[PDB]
A and B are shown apart, each in its own frame.
Chain A
Amino acid sequence: MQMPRRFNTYCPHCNEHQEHEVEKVRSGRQTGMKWIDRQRERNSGIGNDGKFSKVPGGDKPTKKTDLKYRCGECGKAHLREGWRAGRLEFQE
């Protein structure tokens, strides 16, 4: 399906109706300064590790929607419930 770039909707961190920009969410670079990030460095040793002795998994014949809705006056984003989108094209 297609879904526009800038549309007038709600935002709970604004309390009114402003033009929301629909942008694809880029992840983020791992610094490695978390709890389980250290478990891969401390809890790991010679032969087998259980959960650390694995490889990345697969998927369904369709992935959901992970979008960010930044508005016009404030630019705040609300995390909306993602639907099983096949291919998303932002008009204009």
Chain B
Amino acid sequence: ARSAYSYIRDAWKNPGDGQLAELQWQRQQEWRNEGAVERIERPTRLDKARSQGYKAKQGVIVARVSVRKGSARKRRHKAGRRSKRQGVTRITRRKDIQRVAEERASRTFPNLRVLNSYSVGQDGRQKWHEVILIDPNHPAIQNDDDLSWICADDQADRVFRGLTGAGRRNRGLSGKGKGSEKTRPSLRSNGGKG
């Protein structure tokens, strides 16, 4: 039969219809009043969290984050930039809101590494994302056959280097064949034409 988890997954397919609609109207009232990064004991989406790698273990942290909405908070030109390089409100950035969210969250927790993240909704002025974090130094994770990879020296600050699942997706590394000549092995190696 179906898993109890599959009933949260099926609910989040439409986060504006029914029981979840009335839930998110309520929650966001407290979330708007909550900080930038708030550590929360239990995730909002169990299926998604577990799917991404979350366990109910010692040293597996989850934290909600809220980033401003829209495009870029881009100013104007002080020095002589042409007509083409004069867009203030019409241009956006190259890192999606989920990546900023993951970074803000990894800096709030300078010892924990980012596992993965997901969206927990949005309103007119902000976007919320919940980020799963892991403690690399906790022996509860050092001897875990499903999570001990994150304890390697080369995995240090993995979000900032774009080695996150959310990172590789923004870097244009999803496709294995066509239209991924300029993106693999890295953008920098390909001169930044990604």
Name which residue of chain B comes closest to A48, CB basis: B83
Chain B 75-91 residues near chain A, CB threshold 8 A: 82-87, 90-91
**Total count of chain B residues near the partner, CB < 8 A:** 8
Residues of A within 8 A of B83 (CB): 46-48
> In the bound complex, what is the Cα–Cα distance between A47 and B85 (angstroms)?
8
Name which residue of chain B comes closest to A47, CB basis: B83
Name which residue of chain B comes closest to A46, CB basis: B87
Main secondary structure, interface of A, reads loop
Does A48 contact B82, Cβ atoms closer than 8 Å? yes
CB distance from B65 to the nearest CB of A (A): 31
Q: Is A45 an interface residue (CB 8 A)?
A: yes
CB distance from A43 to the nearest CB of B (A): 12
> In the bound complex, what is the Cα–Cα distance between A48 and B82 (angstroms)?
9
> In the bound complex, what is the Cα–Cα distance between A34 and B82 (angstroms)?
31
Residues of B within 8 A of A48 (CB): 82-84
Residues of A within 8 A of B87 (CB): 46-47
> In the bound complex, what is the Cα–Cα distance between A46 and B90 (angstroms)?
8
Chain A 65-85 residues near chain B, CB threshold 8 A: none
CB distance from A54 to the nearest CB of B (A): 15
Residues of B within 8 A of A47 (CB): 82-87
The 8 A CB mask of A5-34 against B (1 = contact, 0 = none) is 000000000000000000000000000000
Name which residue of chain A comes closest to B82, CB basis: A47
Residues of A within 8 A of B90 (CB): 46
Residues of A within 8 A of B82 (CB): 47-48
CB distance from B137 to the nearest CB of A (A): 48
> In the bound complex, what is the Cα–Cα distance between A45 and B91 (angstroms)?
11
Residues of B within 8 A of A45 (CB): 84
The 8 A CB mask of B52-91 against A (1 = contact, 0 = none) is 0000000000000000000000000000001111110011
Which residues of B are at the interface with A, using a C-beta cutoff of 8 A? 82-87, 90-91
16 contacts between A and B (CB under 8 A): A45-B84, A46-B83, A46-B84, A46-B86, A46-B87, A46-B90, A46-B91, A47-B82, A47-B83, A47-B84, A47-B85, A47-B86, A47-B87, A48-B82, A48-B83, A48-B84
Which residues of A are at the interface with B, using a C-beta cutoff of 8 A? 45-48
Sort A-B residue pairs by CB-CB distance and give the 10 closest, nearest first: A47-B83, A46-B87, A48-B83, A47-B84, A47-B86, A46-B90, A48-B84, A46-B84, A46-B86, A45-B84
